Design a protein around this motif. Structure first.
Motif, PDB file in Angstrom:
ATOM      1  N   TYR A   1      -7.299  -3.808 -12.740  1.00 48.67           N
ATOM      2  CA  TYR A   1      -6.761  -3.233 -11.561  1.00 48.67           C
ATOM      3  C   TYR A   1      -5.989  -4.160 -10.983  1.00 48.67           C
ATOM      4  O   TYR A   1      -6.041  -5.436 -11.139  1.00 48.67           O
ATOM      5  N   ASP A   2      -4.711  -3.720 -10.143  1.00 52.10           N
ATOM      6  CA  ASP A   2      -3.920  -4.470  -9.130  1.00 52.10           C
ATOM      7  C   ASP A   2      -4.197  -3.888  -7.835  1.00 52.10           C
ATOM      8  O   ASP A   2      -4.290  -2.765  -7.500  1.00 52.10           O
ATOM      9  N   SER A   3      -4.203  -5.044  -6.670  1.00 50.53           N
ATOM     10  CA  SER A   3      -4.377  -4.585  -5.378  1.00 50.53           C
ATOM     11  C   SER A   3      -2.838  -3.891  -4.993  1.00 50.53           C
ATOM     12  O   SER A   3      -2.954  -3.283  -3.452  1.00 50.53           O
ATOM     13  N   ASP A   4      -1.810  -3.933  -5.836  1.00 50.60           N
ATOM     14  CA  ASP A   4      -0.444  -3.099  -4.991  1.00 50.60           C
ATOM     15  C   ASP A   4      -0.790  -1.510  -5.026  1.00 50.60           C
ATOM     16  O   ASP A   4      -0.806  -1.020  -4.156  1.00 50.60           O
ATOM     17  N   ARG A   5      -1.372  -0.954  -6.164  1.00 50.58           N
ATOM     18  CA  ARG A   5      -1.517   0.273  -6.530  1.00 50.58           C
ATOM     19  C   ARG A   5      -2.762   0.723  -5.332  1.00 50.58           C
ATOM     20  O   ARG A   5      -2.341   1.757  -4.447  1.00 50.58           O
ATOM     21  N   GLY A   6      -3.784  -0.040  -5.311  1.00 52.13           N
ATOM     22  CA  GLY A   6      -4.893   0.151  -4.514  1.00 52.13           C
ATOM     23  C   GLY A   6      -6.212  -0.341  -5.213  1.00 52.13           C
ATOM     24  O   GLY A   6      -6.249  -1.114  -6.219  1.00 52.13           O
ATOM     25  N   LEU A   7      -7.378   0.447  -4.996  1.00 48.42           N
ATOM     26  CA  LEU A   7      -8.705   0.042  -5.383  1.00 48.42           C
ATOM     27  C   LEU A   7      -9.778   1.199  -5.130  1.00 48.42           C
ATOM     28  O   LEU A   7     -10.892   1.273  -5.378  1.00 48.42           O
TER      29      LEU A   7
ATOM     30  N   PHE B   1       7.068   9.211  -0.520  1.00 43.98           N
ATOM     31  CA  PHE B   1       6.157   8.367  -1.050  1.00 43.98           C
ATOM     32  C   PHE B   1       5.787   7.344  -0.309  1.00 43.98           C
ATOM     33  O   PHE B   1       5.837   7.531   1.154  1.00 43.98           O
ATOM     34  N   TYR B   2       4.461   6.652  -0.498  1.00 43.47           N
ATOM     35  CA  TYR B   2       4.005   5.497   0.368  1.00 43.47           C
ATOM     36  C   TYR B   2       3.387   4.565  -0.801  1.00 43.47           C
ATOM     37  O   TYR B   2       2.917   4.686  -1.827  1.00 43.47           O
ATOM     38  N   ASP B   3       3.291   3.324  -0.228  1.00 43.49           N
ATOM     39  CA  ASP B   3       2.455   2.368  -0.754  1.00 43.49           C
ATOM     40  C   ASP B   3       1.115   2.267  -0.168  1.00 43.49           C
ATOM     41  O   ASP B   3       0.697   3.044   0.313  1.00 43.49           O
ATOM     42  N   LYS B   4       0.466   1.105  -0.667  1.00 42.67           N
ATOM     43  CA  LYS B   4      -1.000   0.865  -0.038  1.00 42.67           C
ATOM     44  C   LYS B   4      -0.801   0.536   1.503  1.00 42.67           C
ATOM     45  O   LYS B   4      -1.575   1.168   2.339  1.00 42.67           O
ATOM     46  N   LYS B   5       0.138  -0.068   1.892  1.00 43.94           N
ATOM     47  CA  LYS B   5       0.579  -0.337   3.062  1.00 43.94           C
ATOM     48  C   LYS B   5       0.920   0.603   4.195  1.00 43.94           C
ATOM     49  O   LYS B   5       0.285   0.780   5.138  1.00 43.94           O
TER      50      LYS B   5
END
Ligand SMILES: CC(=O)N[C@@H]1[C@@H](O)[C@H](O)[C@@H](CO)O[C@H]1O
Lengths: 402, 151
Positions: free
Chosen positions: B128-134, B67-71
């Protein structure tokens, strides 16, 4: 004397690097002298950034100075968070609180939000490029609901250069659907000159249009091609050429030979390169304050493989962070002071409008006072031809006999 | 013929890891198998993912599921893109054409752009949330001018 530091420089950044060497000479003293280790890498590729950062951590540096892109910024920040290696950069500030980072670039968000509030805009376009993060875009979208703006946000970044002439003309025909006359160019200076080149071609630079160049290098690009268009242009300037300290630097900068120092024979310096020169002065006085406070900072032995499991953080990196974040000197970016997170504080940003006589300082804001400048009574050309509109209908406006 | 595989799973994800274990038993054959090494990690820390990717690469896996996150996503893409290791993930797709990545999740944004059209919406609220992305938020804003939406 020989204090080792890691240097990470992109392959297209000539003036940005040549500004680092000029800083190495101006701030070197007899007490000690920094010993950089430089490696030119593609900053976007985060694996090379991971490989290069570990190439410095093994050689036993005490601080690292470099850059990052949107793709690679996470690699730097997390490595410096666990290994306690201090990182100084002129690239954009992180989207939050990240330690062991010294972001020389100031927070532009508070400038743009205020500048839009000065002109009393309640409807504007905003062409952003993801290359420098979407932190500035999240702010205008957050502030869109409080002040009831109507933002026309277009990700202009993801475009190719062989279909560039077709899509840019296709962009402004979408901006024509609302009859948009208030654009914000939140791009790097290179894309700005690409946008500006297309703005003249279609002819959206005449009396009526108003642009904002949302970056710290307003005078750094080429502005003479939309100066006489008539359309008002705004921007932001951090490298104040009015100050004396810069006027001294420019004298020495203007003379240097362009063969040895590429991109240096000009009368101006990019806000990237200008922060590089000032970044040296922060790293200098930080280790200098480490001497005066009588602190032992040299490594006990080998740093080892950066992939150390369990993770080993050297304790004497904390004092390097604490010393870097206590530096308060003067440079090309005005006052240079850092908070506990490494964000620039107490700083000063000038606001520049483009008139017929070239750039002109009109405003400035501060993290405690906004849009202050009163007043620019000096200079002043005192020239204006008002545009009056009417219709040919007798007897109000009739064409003469001859 | 025991094939070795890199397994990258976050901590709070339990049913996901359950499904992985179910899939192996259902598909494991008599003549070859999947021998995973499971590194449970925090997906957000870019160093941790880097540190875990090399623990898998040194053990000599033939492919990596993770898996991976936005970062951390850019950490995976460039690491696999240079080392030619194959990565398979149900995380959100890559904003671009990054090779040696197998995105199991399909492109949702195109469907949402169409559903907003069907209901003939002209002004709406987007959360929206900046954790998931945009990247979907970039997409709705990309076609907010083109299709006259007051987001
Ligand atoms: C409260 C304070 O520190 N104010 C200083 C000011 O004294 C100094 O002249 C200026 C230099 O640009 O920087 C400001 O931050």
């Amino acid at each position: 004397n020989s204090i080792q530091i890691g240097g990470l420089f992109p392959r297209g950044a000539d003036q940005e690097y040549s500004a680092f060497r000029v800083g190495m000479v101006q701030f070197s003293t007899s007490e000690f002298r920094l010993t950089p280790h430089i490696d030119n890498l593609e900053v976007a590729n985060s694996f090379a950034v991971t490989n290069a950062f570990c190439s410095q951590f093994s050689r036993g540096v005490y601080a690292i100075f470099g850059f990052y892109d949107k793709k690679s910024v996470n690699t730097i920040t997390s490595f410096c968070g666990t290994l306690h290696v201090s990182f100084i950069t002129p690239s954009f500030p992180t989207d939050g609180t990240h330690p062991f980072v010294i972001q020389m670039r100031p927070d532009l968000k508070g400038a743009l939000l205020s500048l839009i509030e000065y002109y009393q805009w309640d409807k504007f376009a905003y062409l952003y490029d993801s290359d420098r993060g979407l932190s500035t875009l999240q702010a205008v979208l957050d502030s869109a609901a409080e002040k009831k703006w109507q933002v026309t946000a277009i990700n202009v970044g993801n475009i190719n250069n062989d279909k560039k002439d077709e899509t840019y003309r296709s962009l402004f025909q979408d901006l024509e659907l609302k009859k948009e006359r208030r654009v914000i160019l939140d791009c790097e200076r290179d894309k700005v000159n690409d946008i500006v080149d297309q703005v003249i071609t279609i002819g959206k630079h005449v009396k009526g249009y108003h642009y904002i160049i949302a970056n710290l290098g307003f005078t750094d690009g080429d502005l003479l091609k939309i100066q006489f268009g008539g359309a008002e242009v705004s921007g932001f300037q951090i490298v104040d050429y009015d100050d004396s300290l810069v006027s001294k630097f420019i004298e020495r900068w203007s003379t240097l030979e362009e063969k040895e120092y590429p991109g240096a024979h000009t009368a101006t310096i990019k806000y990237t390169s200008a922060l590089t020169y000032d970044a040296v002065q922060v790293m200098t006085e930080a280790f200098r304050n480490l001497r005066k406070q009588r602190i032992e900072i040299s490594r006990r032995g080998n740093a080892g493989d950066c992939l150390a499991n369990p993770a080993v953080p050297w304790g004497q990196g904390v004092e390097i962070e604490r010393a870097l974040k206590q530096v308060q000197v003067e440079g090309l970016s005005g006052n240079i002071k850092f908070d506990q997170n490494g964000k620039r504080i107490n700083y000063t940003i000038n606001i520049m409008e483009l008139k017929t006589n070239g750039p002109r300082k009109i405003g400035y804001w501060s993290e405690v006072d906004k849009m202050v400048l009163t007043e620019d009574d000096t200079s002043g050309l005192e020239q204006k031809t008002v545009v009056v509109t009417t219709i040919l209908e007798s007897p109000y406006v009739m064409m003469k006999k001859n």
